[PDB]
Amino acid sequence: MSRIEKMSILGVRSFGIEDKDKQIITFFSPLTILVGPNGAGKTTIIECLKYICTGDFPPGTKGNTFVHDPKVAQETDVRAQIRLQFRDVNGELIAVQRSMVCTQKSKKTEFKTLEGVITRTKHGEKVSLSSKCAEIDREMISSLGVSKAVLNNVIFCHQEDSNWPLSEGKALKQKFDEIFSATRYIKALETLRQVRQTQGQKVKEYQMELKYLKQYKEKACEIRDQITSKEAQLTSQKGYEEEIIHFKKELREPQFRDAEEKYREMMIVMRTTELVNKDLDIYYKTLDQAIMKFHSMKMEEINKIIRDLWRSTYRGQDIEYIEIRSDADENVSASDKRRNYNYRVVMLKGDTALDMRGRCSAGQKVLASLIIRLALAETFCLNCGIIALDEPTTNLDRENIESLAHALVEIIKSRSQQRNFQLLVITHDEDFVELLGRSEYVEKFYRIKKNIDQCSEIVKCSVSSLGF
Amino acid sequence: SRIEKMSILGVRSFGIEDKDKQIITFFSPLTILVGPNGAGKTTIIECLKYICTGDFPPGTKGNTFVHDPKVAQETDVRAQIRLQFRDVNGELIAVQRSMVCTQKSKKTEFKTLEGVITREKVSLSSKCAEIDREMISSLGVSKAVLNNVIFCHQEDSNWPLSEGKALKQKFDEIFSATRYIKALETLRQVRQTQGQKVKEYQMELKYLKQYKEKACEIRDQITSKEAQLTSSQKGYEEEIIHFKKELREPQFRDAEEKYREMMIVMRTTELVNKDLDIYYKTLDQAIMKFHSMKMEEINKIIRDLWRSTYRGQDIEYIEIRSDADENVSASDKRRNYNYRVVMLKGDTALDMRGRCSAGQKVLASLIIRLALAETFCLNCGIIALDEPTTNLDRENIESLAHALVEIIKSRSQQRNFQLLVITHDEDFVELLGRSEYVEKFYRIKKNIDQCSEIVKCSVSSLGFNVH
Amino acid sequence: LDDENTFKILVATDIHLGFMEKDAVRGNDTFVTLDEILRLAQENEVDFILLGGDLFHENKPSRKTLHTCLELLRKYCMGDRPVQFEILSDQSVNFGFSKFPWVNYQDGNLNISIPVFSIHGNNDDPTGADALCALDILSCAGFVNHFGRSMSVEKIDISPVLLQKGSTKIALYGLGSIPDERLYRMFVNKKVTMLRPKEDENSWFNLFVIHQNRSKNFIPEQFLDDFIDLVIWGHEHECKIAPTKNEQQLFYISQPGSSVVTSLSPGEAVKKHVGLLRIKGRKMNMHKIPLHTVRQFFMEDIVLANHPDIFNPDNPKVTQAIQSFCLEKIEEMLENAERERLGNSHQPEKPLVRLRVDYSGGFEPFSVLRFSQKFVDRVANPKDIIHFFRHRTLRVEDLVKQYFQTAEKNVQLSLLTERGMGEAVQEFVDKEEKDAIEELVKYQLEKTQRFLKERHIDALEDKIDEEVRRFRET
Amino acid sequence: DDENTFKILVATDIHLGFMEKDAVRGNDTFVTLDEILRLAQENEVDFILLGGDLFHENKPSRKTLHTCLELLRKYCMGDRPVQFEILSDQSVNFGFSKFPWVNYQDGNLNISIPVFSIHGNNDDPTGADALCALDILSCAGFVNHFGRSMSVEKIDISPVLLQKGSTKIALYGLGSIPDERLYRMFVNKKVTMLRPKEDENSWFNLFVIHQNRSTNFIPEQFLDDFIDLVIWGHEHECKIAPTKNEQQLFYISQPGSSVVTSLSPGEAVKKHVGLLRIKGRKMNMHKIPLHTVRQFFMEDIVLANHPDIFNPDNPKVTQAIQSFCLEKIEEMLENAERERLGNSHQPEKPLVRLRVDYSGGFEPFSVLRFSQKFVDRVANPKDIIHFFRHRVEDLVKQYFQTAEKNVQLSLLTERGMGEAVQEFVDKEEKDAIEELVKYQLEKTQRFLKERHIDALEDKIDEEVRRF
Amino acid sequence: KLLLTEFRSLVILKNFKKFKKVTYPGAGKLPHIIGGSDLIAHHARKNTELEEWLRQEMEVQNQHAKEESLADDLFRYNPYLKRR
DNA sequence: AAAAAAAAAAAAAAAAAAAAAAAAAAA
DNA sequence: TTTTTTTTTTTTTTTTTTTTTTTTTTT
Ligand SMILES: Nc1ncnc2c1ncn2[C@@H]1O[C@H](COP(=O)(O)OP(=O)(O)O)[C@@H](O)[C@H]1O
Ligand code: BEF
Ligand SMILES: [Mg+2]
Ligand SMILES: [Mg+2]
Ligand SMILES: [Mn+2]
């Protein structure tokens, strides 16, 4: 039970900076349609939602780019704020805010977040807590009931960041161990790898120095032998004594007085470091195997979800089903320069399993990513039934568009009962909208446009008695 | 230059047996490809690109391109692609590049066999490089243009909005100056190798200097003790032979000359490293200046096309700007590239990449491709638009249709122009001169065995496969 | 018996024209069934046709759909047969949305044999600033009398389409397809109103046509007013053309159903019927008329968990048993459909077969891709034959600890002790020391190096690792 | 006139629904059609002869169809008598309908002014059933769609024979075929016109054709001389006054559009609908100006032909150009105000377009800022001003020479690295660079060691300076 | 530069329109129009159970509006601690 | 004329360095 | 409060490793 109620965008990308340009958008249930021209600001709303929820900017965008550019504004600095109002899992009303500043300095530009505010209503009164962008995450991550990884990837997936299930092995593995909440074990594994490389470099340097220390050791031993022989000769001759004194002085140089001790110590340290390296390799292999077993065991019931979703949705007698499958590398070691990640979405073309990456179409990739996101939303976003589809009908033909509309209608029916499901749809296709709205869920939709000053504006429109 | 026929066999979902050889005939000036998702529309453009330049689709290594030997339940899948077309002069040429994907153990071997060139009807076996150059010469455009402007993949279609290094590689392959960047890489690698050698040699230098100092101390002792012996006692004779043994030792025998030679090499490599740094900086500046000079001309085309096509009032116009790094050097670990498509919101210029919308990005990519086709595709008037209206809104779809119709009208004045479109939009096909140009379109579907077929359909059944 | 005081009304509902018009098998089903409906209206000499809504499947019907609808309406609903009933109602408030606010048969330039009175369904509800629907186009052409459309969002006041043939009198109340939650809000805010004739109110039939969801939000059937005598109900495709009266509502509820199979619901397998209504003063007699052009739809539901006799979850060859059972069920359904196809020649040869298999006791669905390949040219829904569905802990720490203990006992650690690196990794994960692994490695290295130095061991690898093993064992 | 006079209102390109979603520009074609129907009703015309393109879109929206239906019902239906006959076989003239008769001959339709129309290319029949919007209109019963092409292979034109009293009219018609196809049919002698064998010379023939006039040209030579008045379409320049070419014995009428669809300089002339009066073989065409058609003023300016105010390399010419454009658009916005008096039906906001052509090197100003000034004065603020226009080796050599003459070369000889890179580029020698670097060190190092240098850090540098 | 012209037999106050308005009972007579004033908003007797359901859902609506008012005033809250 | 062993080029994808903001002292 | 140094994330360029191609060198 968590719903995003209303937003306030100011100074974000193409939105205006004066307080008279503060745009407010109220999300309806169970369907919210956003329409507008290219560059109007539809995707900026989801970007603001993601930034409020988790504090991460859109992909490829740093702080300098997310906020309005001071140069276009003809202003020294620009201060942006985003205000979100929502209910946490228990239904209590919470409003959060995040401030922002971009200062135009010389050629580059500087970015900085001001302290944000957490506001609730306790005992009929109003409270405010200025927080530092790290309590306005943890706290509202706990309030929303879902983790940062799912909020970034499943629910508020950016339009550019979509089709992330069909990404490289390491990227997919990273997405799925942030989703599975096991990032710290991979951190420990990489710490093991790094310490192994450090100890290996130390071993190489120790061998290099050991060569010279062996040379020194043998030369000093020969000097000592000649000293003892000369003393034996003398004790049984002033020049003999002078030679003896000179050889003692040759024993007196720092690289000869301390000769045996350094060689012994360096031998012990290199051998112990080598044994530690072997044991570290063993432990790293074991931990990697355990992590890839856990991954496969938690993708067991999502693959099981993904299969049914793909069989219901995809209109084609081509792929039986698709599933995510991972496979650990048998011949892996902590000393390897490049690791191998077998984390791929697999297509079941007949009775044989292929790899979807580089082998599917654009529409198939879009549908597979949508199905994977919906399965992950079913598995993890149980307490926060929100999903934002940014042009889900991209590269989808007529039959798949209709089937996706039917599947989304079924999801709405199955999740709106005793729970709140908010499907935010930003589309340019009126047919998809009509297909979803045939169940009569849409009464008002938001049309994002721009004024004469080219600042984004959000205005609520009506399907009936008003334009569409 | 125009393309007439294509024959696809054993590529992706196309069938392996000789009964599944699909044939597609390209019309002029507009050819429409329609069909369900995962049917073979984009595979046709992929086959065209592969037969033109030999390059596989992005992300494909050649073993995911041929029909999986497993789904065929075979141990080998022989794949053939043919393309009958006309070169710039107007002669008929057909190339028949082939390949196999042998299946062994858990891996999947791949290799390409010798294709042929037909010209009266003279067919000769040829290697991949020779057919590549021959078809590049016949079509009249460079391989980079063929890969990026004409037959770019549906995924590699927003390449002008890519990172600085990738955009620079695309544009210096487009401008035909890749050998100079190859020379830049050679210079950087030479400087890095010499720097590493200098580091190791200076590590050895101190040791060598210490050995030399010990040798000099031994020699001074030899001289003093020899003078003492000449002045005159037995021990003054014993220490002499021991000192001669010490000087006899190779570590202290020729330490001076070795240390001198190593220092000479050291200083020499230092000044050579400095010189190579200056030369690398100069050549980088020259390359960036050449890029700016050769790209300012197409900036005007990009500006005018954006002003005509883009219906919004956000961006006045877009262009592309390259700025050389002032403080560049061959010893730098990481270089910074400043290739960027730039949008001008009013009077200030901004970085379009990461700061634009999806529709703005796709429209900008389309404008860049059309400008590069105006500049370089004069000889080969073909452009394949794989779902051009992917993210465009209604007004921009209409404006793009109008611009494409104007391009068709203008560029058909003396040479054939083809605008192969893959789409799921009925309205776009309509507005793209549906009555004027398209009479027969192509439907790509799949039979009961899930092998792609290419069938010619009259325009009466156009709406059955598009929405 | 049809006197001069009888109201023969052909009550159709949810024709759903243009549904799957792009299909090669089911393209012309809806048009043919509408042709049959109009033929029944023409043959029965009905006074007027009363469509219950959803006459079109799409909000904006295609050109073929509109052209076919106009062709059929001109062929059957236009003629020189005189109209037998009056209209004593203010025609500028019932049909007064168009610039021709009068019933179509009364236009001085149109000769209408069978008037058509219809409401708009939610698949063809008005949209846009002008608030137009497909029925608006039909009424502007002059073939249909679109009535009952709401004008104001805040409140709705419906005006009866008063009709009188001889002695009998009908008040034809009609409501459009308002969104279900919005109409619910109107019904609970008392923002709905039914205007009854002011005098003789007890001498009208008060026939009400409504297109909304029922017991299926849902507009319950008790919110409706108690003066009604019949309620035609659309947005419900399971035919119930037979009028049904609940315990206390004082009105009858008729559910004509649909003219085509839109969804594959269990309630959609009922035989489709079109009504033949008769009114004589106050009494009603609805006679059902089967449609012989409606494609058959047979379905079966099987739950594999509730058949332990044959379906054994642990059977390694149970998937082939599932496939064989499904094949036998589909064959039986097809044979049953064929046995019923010899009664009439008008039903389409290919039927609609659906088989929902519920696997929940750890069963694996078979190849639905190839199972449906055995009925490519024998069923009308080749892609949708079998539906597989399921009706609606693990901690990484235990797994990594188990793996660590298993590894320690299957290989021999050389320097670090047992159960030390496991707890170091656990500390790094939980307490976030971010230095536990390095600290442990350095501590063990320095300890063993100090022991080796103070033990006075000569510099040779074999003795070094022998004393290392001795320290590890101790 | 009298009982033996045919009165025909010829409006050709209504283009209903054009810019319907537009705010200012919407609801214009509907009002113009209302005016046309009002003129038809007032003049008591026998029938209306539309020339095709009655709808802008191939599938008109609901608003367009509803408005057309309501206007046709209001004006073309009533109790007024019909005074002419249909002597032709109604099954062939209007037979692609389940009702193959004329609409006023139907026993259930009262038609005062029957409408005879052809289909344009903007609303040509599409789909499996080959239906157009005029098919929907004819099914409703308000329009007599005639002249549809049944066979793709050949064209047979059968006229809708008319007769009012003594006068006889043969009403040939032909919907818009794709222009290249139709041209190929005409060349292949596959177009035929079937004339009555009774009273061959007593019929006044008139052809209603909706095609291009200026392969896509279908000129006037491709029409026989037996006809006498060819009404035309797909041409919006209002030439409603008939013309007779010396080579062509048949008149040509071009009523033109009832709205400004494109901003071409062929829609700036006033639009008229023609009141025609045949009386035997005597025709009298009288134009009637449209008082509700939005005004269109436009001028073409070429900046390269004014070498007196527009200096090509003037640093502040970009403001003189803007001033000239501002003064121009202002005389037109005023010539519009001065010309709008009296015509109360004229829309307040006119259409102003300026085409600016530059080739001397002018830089277009901010078209957004210029269009921000006239926003509530022109009906098309977005489209006010149009702006349009009708090497490595040497550069690297120059840059290397500049670098050599700029900074002090340490050890590499002058013009060494440049030749090395040039050899690497053309000869593709990959070792052309390393070889030179190594060969310079090896040489100068030798030179240094022969002189047994003292290896002092700065003394070796002086030795290299000697080089 | 011409067209094929071939001849066939196509021929197969005063009026030629075929239309007679088939009279409807009440055509041309006094229009006894019923509407406007004589259209009253009738009621629904007692219907306690129906009254109970309507009142309960009205209370639900009132509670929802109460929550919505709290939402609105929470959003309009100016951030006092916005100095940072 | 054919095999095969080895060296070179490509590229997909993991690795890493520079930039910038956040956090943590730190006065 | 502000300064200054250290951490962490991102992102965009770099490096690696396997595969294919090609070269050569033999049979
Ligand atoms: N920092 C910025 N300053 C000004 N305008 C910006 C800035 N960043 C992005 N924009 C512009 O603001 C708009 C953002 O709209 P967006 O949400 O991406 O579009 P859409 O809703 O069509 O997907 C685009 O026109 C973009 O170029
Ligand atoms: F699936 Be395809 F790219 F439309
Ligand atoms: Mg977007
Ligand atoms: Mg594709
Ligand atoms: Mn035209």
Author numbering:
A (entry chain A): 1 to 236, 1078 to 1309
B (entry chain B): 2 to 120, 125 to 237, 1078 to 1312
C (entry chain E): 7 to 222, 227 to 402, 426 to 507
D (entry chain D): 8 to 221, 226 to 401, 428 to 504
E (entry chain F): 653 to 664, 682 to 753
Describing publication, verbatim:
The core MR complex contains two copies of both the ATPase RAD50 and the endo-/exonuclease MRE11, assembled in an elongated structure. This structure consists of a “head” module which includes MRE11 and the ATP binding cassette type nucleotide binding domains (NBDs) of RAD50, and a “tail” module formed by the coiled-coil domains (CCDs) of RAD50.
The highest resolution structures were obtained by incubating MR or MH129NRN (nuclease dead mutant, hereafter referred to as ‘MRN’) with 50 bp DNA and ATP at 35 °C for 30 min, followed by addition of BeFx (producing the ATP mimic ADP•BeFx after ATP hydrolysis). Our structure resolves a single NBS1 polypeptide (651-754), which wraps around the MRE11 dimer with the highly conserved K683NFKKFKK690 motif situated across the two-fold symmetry axis. DNA interactions are virtually identical in MR and in MRN complexes. During 3D classification, we identified two separable conformational states in MR and MRN, one with the MRE11 dimer symmetrically attached to both RAD50NBDs, and one where the MRE11 catalytic domain dimer detaches as a rigid body from one RAD50NBD. In the case of MRN, the detachment is only observed at the RAD50NBD not bound to NBS1.
